[PDB]
Design a protein around this ligand. Structure first.
Ligand code: HEM
Ligand SMILES: [Ca+2]
Ligand SMILES: [Ca+2]
Length: 329
């Protein structure tokens, strides 16, 4: 099919996305950047989609977190989500796709702006949200590992799929876990979709980057990096530890598994055969920048081995003394 301005796409319903792509690239993502708005939009895909259970209900990836914002943004597990919901709302109102479709589209577009990123499949045609999600369907960083894995499992994900989705934490920061240090990332490269998250979570903790005693937080290995309790534990749990380690220095696996599993997440509560494939709209991501490494001054002795089948791979350390991670502006 050929769209209004001459750009082409396999299925013509997808032509509606070209002006939306242009608008979000220029006015939401600040000229197609991998920064705060991309990170927040990616988080939103999950907080919308995971509100789905075959028994507890919820419509999944249905735009409910925007349409029923006054309900859902008040759930404790949605702390800080209000900002991006408020930013996306005028875009939904202006354009001609459902809120559910917009959230997933913006997330996919955003990931495609990140160096090292991947093209996530995108389908069009989610109907409007019917009702707000039930509360208590979104995992929290202080939930038991078995509880997180069961909740994700209930929604449809295997334990290894949870690991693959958590590649998102490679381009991610926290504002509310420790409010004294907003914008503190989960890895040393929050602008690069890479394996540093999987490496750095495996290191022995050293310090709190801000205050002690924050719920859902444990010690980090690096000044300027924050470590979630859940990530600490998932890196170490027999169900997930070997898969976690397998991501280290395996960029193609991180990319391919993230894309496939994000597609699955984007379709929670939906039926792929009742949607239209618009995957070819998503731009081509920039190449990976950097290579897998231990932080400067670290060695393999600083890694906590938790995979019972295979030792952690030898990685070179950055040269010099250990330094500090800058916050996401
Ligand atoms: C598996 C259980 C998960 C837990 C417990 C968890 C927890 C968290 C927490 C506590 C934050 C910081 C929020 C704040 O204080 O500002 C965060 C940020 C984020 N989460 Fe996860 N998350 C999980 C899964 C996911 C998944 C599956 C995705 C996939 C899209 C995702 C994407 C993000 C992103 C991109 C951010 C960064 C947002 C920003 O920079 O402001 N998370 N997550
Ligand atoms: Ca939802
Ligand atoms: Ca990274």
């Amino acid at each position: 099919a050929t769209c209004a301005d001459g750009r082409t796409t396999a299925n013509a319903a997808c032509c509606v996305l070209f002006p939306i792509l242009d608008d979000i690239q220029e006015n939401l993502f600040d000229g197609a950047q991998c920064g705060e708005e991309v990170h927040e939009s990616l988080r939103l895909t999950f907080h919308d989609a995971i509100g789905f259970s075959p028994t507890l209900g919820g419509g999944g990836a249905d735009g409910s977190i925007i349409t029923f914002d006054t309900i859902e943004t008040n759930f404790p597990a949605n702390a800080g989500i209000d900002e991006i919901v408020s930013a996306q709302k005028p875009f939904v109102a202006k354009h001609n796709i459902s809120a559910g479709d917009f959230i997933q589209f913006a997330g996919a577009v955003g990931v495609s702006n990140c160096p090292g990123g991947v093209r996530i499949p995108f389908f069009l045609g989610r109907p409007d949200a019917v009702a707000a999600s039930p509360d208590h369907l979104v995992p929290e960083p202080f939930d038991s590992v078995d509880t997180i894995l069961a909740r994700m499992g209930d929604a449809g994900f295997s334990a290894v799929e949870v690991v693959w989705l958590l590649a998102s934490h490679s381009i991610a920061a926290a504002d509310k876990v420790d409010p004294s240090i907003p914008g503190t990332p989960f890895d040393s490269t929050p602008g690069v979709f890479d394996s540093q998250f999987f490496i750095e979570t495996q290191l022995k903790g050293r310090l709190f980057p801000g205050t002690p005693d924050n719920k859902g937080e444990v010690q980090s290995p690096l000044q300027g990096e924050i470590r979630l309790q859940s990530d600490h534990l998932l890196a170490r749990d027999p169900q997930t530890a070997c898969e976690w380690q397998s991501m280290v220095n395996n960029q193609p696996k991180i990319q391919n598994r993230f894309a496939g599993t994000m597609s699955k997440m984007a379709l929670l509560g939906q039926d792929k055969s009742k949607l239209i494939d618009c995957s070819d709209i998503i731009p081509t991501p920039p190449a990976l920048v950097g290579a897998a490494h231990l932080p400067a001054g670290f060695s393999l002795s600083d890694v906590e081995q938790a995979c019972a089948e295979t030792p952690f791979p030898a990685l070179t350390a950055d040269p010099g003394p250990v330094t500090s991670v800058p916050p996401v502006p």
